[PDB]
Symmetry: D2
Subunit: 115 residues, 4 copies
């Protein structure tokens, strides 16, 4: 699996479960076109987003619909969503894990890129 | 100043200087329309982006140009930029401070919102 | 002020007010000796902990009493406190700002170090 | 496994590998006594720290020797180490994953507690 997304909840200290995640790739005319999407599991992870063949170099945006997540749990969300924008670079064989740590008014995201 | 941005470099333990920041605001046609932009100073802070009058209700997107910042310092960053999207002044004017902590492959961003 | 602490609440998007902070400094016998303590103000900042004269070289430990802070606000935090340990003024006096971002089960802490 | 530790490197966007981790439990006289320790693997993880039987309620401190880690890679570390202090509470069945994200002058730590 070339691209993984893991989402954690910093309030409850648990994985962010029923979370919608949309991945877009930047089209030649700079528009963002749907690339992949899904909902985090009970482990806060989303696998099977794409395949090695489809995941070509280019700019990608991982959009995490955090607002709905926090609303369900009664917290008042700050962000509309979390946006992770990056360039997939082939240079060598790589796997991407976009990790996101969420709080109502804050979030962190790290990219773990392994061989 | 109703919208400020402060950026820190977690590798150097100092303000993130000369970081370009672009603010957009969702238009009626769901298009991201340019709202304001600037760059952080020696203290890693960006003030004067907009005024209370101009900063009306809306969904804003604050794009912090992290990639350009790291590249200029000789690093190989992962992200293109940090994108902070949020609805503003939904219940009256508020002062927003968008803080961002930067590392080549990871960044934190957290808003401090106060009633003026 | 050579050692400042600033704390933010990532759940409320505001300064972390009334947060007790205890500073210790490793003694000759490797014991943690009390150095200074205080609590953050309405702006989530703690100034006046020590002076340049008193803040000598050494390994310091800044304990941010996060648990007491969350409990008082009705939350069930994971950590007892945030512990920032670091060697200070190893190459001359420096001004240190220990910043901490708090959530019930997670916290970030990052130092901004500048030459006066 | 009751207690896990995962360490990531935010500079290189990879797991913090050869990292020493010491776990201490607070003794009745408030001193910190050795409880467990090891070195993160190639996946930046440390399993087998303790057993369900030995992991009793109490206050624990996870010390991550980050200074040596950064020195090896040529970065100038700020912290002597990362310290995660917490109370193990039985109330229900739980697993602890102490995650730490490291940067030379900054680090984050989250506690993921699952059933």
């Amino acid at each position: 699996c070339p691209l993984m997304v893991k989402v954690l909840d910093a309030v409850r200290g648990s994985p962010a479960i029923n979370v919608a995640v949309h991945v877009f790739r930047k089209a030649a005319d700079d528009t963002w076109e749907p690339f992949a999407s899904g909902k985090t599991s009970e482990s806060g992870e989303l696998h099977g987003l794409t395949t090695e063949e489809e995941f070509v170099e280019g700019i990608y945006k991982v959009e995490i619909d955090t607002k709905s997540y926090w609303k369900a749990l009664g917290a008042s969300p700050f962000h509309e969503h979390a946006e992770v924008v990056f360039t997939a670079n082939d240079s060598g064989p790589r796997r991407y894990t976009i990790a996101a740590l969420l709080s109502p008014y804050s979030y962190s995201t790290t990219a773990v890129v392994t061989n």
